[PDB]
Every structure is written in structure tokens, then in C-alpha cells.
Nucleic acid binder design. Structure first.
Lengths: 452, 91
RNA sequence: GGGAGUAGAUAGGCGCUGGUGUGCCUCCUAGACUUCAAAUCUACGGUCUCGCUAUUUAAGCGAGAGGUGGGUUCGAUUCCCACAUACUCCCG
């Protein structure tokens, strides 16, 4: 027992084995981790050999020297992929962020008056113009955007909402569970599938401080189903003197039909010009910018929200703020194609095949590869457009040696890693989400796994 | 926050007795904030951190320190001699 | 004087490492080599000590200590704790 462990060398001795091989710091860390795995494996009597030690210690070093979060090549064809980090950023934005983070900036400083200033002041100019709302505000994310409006205007008082709009988006967010913690009392009207206007108007009373509607972003209902029109709820509010609050969620900044895609998804400008008092949404969904809770509406309300002592715990960071301004700057200049998420969904059907076969031309040489391009209909929107179904070209592949399952697995372990769909033992690569500079990296990773 | 605030001691001075004196059935937290953007000199007393933890483990109450500065390491190791607290040491 | 930080050898100065210590530089001594010097290289080397044979001394041989003590541990030079000491910083 006590000889199968004395064996394990000394950390000073393996540090030497890797003089300039690897940084001394990373070597000792790998030696300790490895030194402990052999002390316990020999104590339980499951190891008789120690030759695996030297080879392993170097593997920990090779592993411990790489950050965990890593860029990932998305081949699934889902633009708003909740799991892969939603809306990706254009180089233009990322450099504007790079520069403001490089050194000091006038984040909370107004250069004119030479005294402290509100950091939320830089942006709001853009929002008010783009939406048409009276005033605006921005916080960490939309989850908090909701929580803030409720605790600001309905703490202790009733909020009416349709029983079909109490959603569970994400793993931890649930309108009913957060609104609870929001301090607002929840008044659910109508039924799951159907909800008329009479349901809303019927539950109003002395405590009703808010009429709230949530947009079913991550799901939808078909069959016998009724919903309350937006113009109707504005009318109902202005009748009793109650505010209207729409949680768009998708955070669509513009009309979407303007780009060829025909859908009813709501957007700020239009929802604002409808008579709604407040509107919110995430910046990293249909806006295509960094994570951000966006609120626009009546000035008297925005000012009530801002003054809330909880807004300081949600106030946005220096990175997303800047990055959001450049994203908004692009919107004013109509540079639509510059923002990843808008370009990916409004891409020419022709455009997609053009990239579908430019990849197939790069994989015909690789050994054992069965390459075919198929025209499939998928659902692009992951966290904002549930029903949408648009055509896109998938380059379906298949190797004689390895199986589709094992294939996805190694591809997610590659550097860079690639995540893709699987359908009937045929790995699939949706080109709707693939950047050009990835095509070269796709071919170089597949040739390293099948010819190695 | 929804938490009920029980302020002990006085501005410039605060002994341990002050903390231990306000505990009761509803006391669910013993919280200390580090004065990050200001400081008091002259007749000023503070409760040693070690004593707060001792008081917590006596009555079975958790201790919560808002360092604020977020100092990850000992600062004296770099030539600057200050008593600024840090995660490692405070933990 | 009171706190606190940095700390530690078993030749000497610095740095490291849960594997019974070790690497860099220096000193010393020794060896190798070198026309001379230098350079270079090497050392289960060195301190203290104690104990053993002889015992005037010489001479040969064996063992332990890491500031001190304790603890964890299969194993502590490494880690914890206590006290001491050195250097430094703050206060009366």
C-alpha cells in the first residue's frame, strides 16, 4: 500500500521535467491535481501502474492553459440560440467596445459641465428617436426590466394579465414567480387558449395599477385560441385610467416585413405609436445588440422607474452600454446588413445555397466523406420567433467509419468547436448561421479527425 | 430588499456589545459594510471581523461582508501598506 | 511600548516544491582538465551536535535538527496553530 504511492515523484521533480516545456505555475497546478488523483486511486487500490503519470501531467497542463468560454461555430441554423449566446456582434461594434474599455472614458462624466452625469444619458437619445416614446431607460436584461416596472408601479397593488401569457422563458425565469418577488399582486384573467377583452375589463378595481401583456416568445398555441388585441387594451386603459405595459421580449426595434420576412412580431416604434404606455425587451434577441433590458414609454413613468433604488443594482455595465450605442448608431444609419442577426434571417435563398456548395467544394477531398446539399425548412428563431419557418440549405455529411452521433461529439470538442443538428444518422450544417471565415475552419477540423 | 434594518452602535463608535445586544428571534443576518469612499478619524471604534464571526457562531447567525472594493489578494505583497480586506483572507 | 505585514536551514545570499527536499549564484574544499592563468566542469561534501571505537591528539563510523513546540497526514522543508526572533510599516 505504502509503496504504490511513495512512487509518485515530487512536484519539484516534475517541475524540472518541464524546464521550459510549460510555465512553472501551470506545471505545479497540473502536478498537484495529478498527484491527488494517484494518491486516492492507489489508496482505494485501483492502480498498479504509474507510467500514465508523466503523460497525464502534461495533458492537464495542455488543458489548464485554455479559458473555458470559447467561441463556437454554430451550424444549427438558429439565429437566436439561447444556448450559444444569442445575437453575435459585428466587428464595428466590438472595436468601439474595445476602445472604450482600453482606458478611461466619460461613462458617468459629462464633459460639458465637468461634473458627474448619468451613464444612461448617452443612449436614451437614440431610443427616444427610434421608438418614438417620450423617454427611455435601460437595465441589465429584460428579466430585470420586468421586475423593475412591477416593483416600481405595482408593488402592493394588482396587475391584470392573461392566463395564457404567464410564461417560463429560460431555466429560471417565470412571470408568476418573479412578479411575486416583484411585490406586485397577480390577477390572472381569461383561460389558457382563449382570452377576450371582457376578461381584462372584468378584473379591474381600486387596486388595479397595471395592465400587463407578455408576448409568447418561446412558444405558441394553435387550434381554438383567442387573444386580446393591442389596440383594445390601450382603449381599455385610457377608459379607466390604467397604464399599459407590453413585454415584447423579442426586442424587435423595427417592422420586420420591410425585409421580406412576413410575420406579426411586434416592435417598439409601432407598439409605442399604438398607445401603449410602456414597452420592454432584450437587446440580445431581435435587436442584435449586447444583453440589455430596454424600456421606452411615457416620461412620467420612466422617471418613476429611474428613481427606484433598485435601478442601481440593474444599471448596465460599461461594455454593454458602449456596445449598445454603436448598435443603435448602426440602426440610425440604416446599416441593417451590419448587424448579424438581421443579416442571417434576411439572407437570400440564393445566398444560402451559394455558401452551401462553397463548403461542399471544400470537403470532397477529405477521406470517407459522403457530402450532399439538401434544401430543408427549419425554424430560425430560438428565443424570439417560435412559429417562423424559413427555407435554408443544409450540407448533410456522412463518413463510413464513424457514426453521426460520435461525429457531433468530436466536433464539439474541436478547436474551434462546432455544434450541429442531427437527423436520421445524417449530421446537418445549416448555412443560415455560418460565417464565411468558418468554411475554411470547418474543412481543417474535419480533415484532422478522419485522417488522424 | 424586504429585509428589516436594525442599526446598532453610533456613527463614530461601535463596540461588539452593540451587535450582540440587538440579536433576537428575528435576527437572520449580521451584516458589515466596508467604508469604501470615506473614512472617519478622531474618536472612532469598530468591531474586529474576528469578533463578528465569533458572535455569529455563538448564536448560529450568518455573517455577510460587503467588501465593496473587491480586493482579490493581499495588498501588502506589492509594497503598498494598507489594511484593505480581501476575499481570500476574509473568507 | 501596542498592532500588523514580509520571514526562517543543516556552509553563505535568492527562489521553489505535500513525495522524505531542490534549482540558480556564491564561498570553501576537493577532483578533473588546462604549457601558465583563466575558464569549465563535478560533489546522497560542508553547519551544529551527539554518540560510538581509540582516547593526549590523531583516526574511522553511525545518527538528528529547518527559529521553538504542537498538529494533520502514508509522508510536512512545504500546510495549520501557539510562542519566540529578524526586517519593515501604523499608531501613543
Amino acid at each position: 500500500m505504502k509503496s504504490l504511492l511513495r512512487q509518485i515523484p515530487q512536484i519539484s521533480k516534475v517541475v524540472e521535467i518541464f524546464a521550459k516545456a510549460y510555465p512553472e505555475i501551470y506545471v505545479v497546478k497540473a502536478a498537484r491535481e495529478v498527484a491527488e488523483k494517484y494518491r486516492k486511486e492507489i489508496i482505494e487500490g485501483a492502480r498498479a501502474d504509474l507510467n500514465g503519470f508523466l503523460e497525464d501531467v502534461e495533458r492537464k497542463i495542455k488543458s489548464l492553459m485554455k479559458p473555458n468560454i470559447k467561441r463556437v461555430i454554430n451550424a444549427t441554423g438558429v439565429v437566436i440560440n439561447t444556448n450559444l449566446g444569442r445575437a453575435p456582434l459585428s466587428k464595428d461594434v466590438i472595436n468601439f467596445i474595445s476602445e472604450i474599455a482600453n482606458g478611461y472614458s466619460n461613462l458617468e462624466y459629462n464633459l460639458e459641465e465637468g461634473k458627474r452625469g448619468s451613464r444612461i444619458a448617452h443612449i436614451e437619445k437614440y431610443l427616444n428617436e427610434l421608438t418614438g416614446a417620450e423617454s427611455s431607460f435601460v437595465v441589465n436584461n429584460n428579466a430585470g426590466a420586468v421586475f423593475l416596472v412591477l416593483n416600481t408601479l405595482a408593488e402592493g397593488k394588482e396587475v391584470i394579465i392573461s392566463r395564457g401569457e404567464l410564461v417560463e422563458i429560460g431555466g429560471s425565469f417565470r412571470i408568476p414567480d418573479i412578479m411575486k418577488k416583484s411585490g406586485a399582486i397577480l390577477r390572472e384573467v381569461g383561460t389558457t387558449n382563449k382570452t377576450k377583452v371582457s376578461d381584462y375589463e372584468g378584473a379591474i378595481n381600486q387596486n388595479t395599477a397595471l395592465l400587463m401583456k407578455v408576448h409568447k416568445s418561446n412558444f405558441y398555441m394553435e387550434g381554438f385560441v383567442e387573444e386580446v388585441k393591442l389596440e383594445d387594451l390601450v382603449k381599455l386603459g385610457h377608459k379607466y385610467g390604467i397604464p399599459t405595459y407590453y413585454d415584447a421580449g423579442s426586442g424587435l426595434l423595427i417592422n420586420l416585413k420591410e425585409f421580406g420576412i412576413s410575420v406579426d412580431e411586434p416592435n417598439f416604434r409601432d407598439c409605442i405609436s399604438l398607445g401603449i404606455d410602456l414597452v420592454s425587451g432584450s437587446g440580445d434577441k431581435l435587436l442584435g445588440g449586447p444583453q440589455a433590458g430596454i424600456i421606452v414609454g411615457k416620461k412620467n413613468l420612466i422617471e418613476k422607474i429611474k428613481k427606484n433604488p433598485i435601478a442601481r443594482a440593474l444599471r448596465i455595465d460599461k461594455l454593454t452600454l458602449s456596445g449598445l450605442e454603436m448598435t443603435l448608431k448602426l440602426y440610425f444609419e440604416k446599416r441593417y446588413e451590419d448587424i448579424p442577426v438581421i443579416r442571417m434571417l434576411t439572407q437570400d435563398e440564393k445566398a444560402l445555397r451559394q455558401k452551401a456548395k462553397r463548403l461542399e467544394k471544400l470537403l470532397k477531398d477529405i477521406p470517407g466523406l459522403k457530402i450532399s446539399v439538401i434544401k430543408d425548412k427549419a425554424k430560425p428563431g430560438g428565443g424570439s420567433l417560435p412559429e417562423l419557418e424559413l427555407p435554408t440549405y443544409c450540407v448533410a455529411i456522412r463518413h463510413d467509419r464513424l457514426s453521426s452521433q460520435e461525429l457531433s461529439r468530436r466536433l464539439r470538442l474541436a478547436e474551434p468547436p462546432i455544434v450541429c443538428r442531427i437527423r436520421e444518422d445524417q449530421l446537418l450544417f445549416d448555412m443560415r448561421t455560418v460565417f464565411h471565415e468558418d468554411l475554411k475552419t470547418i474543412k481543417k477540423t474535419l480533415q484532422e479527425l478522419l485522417s488522424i
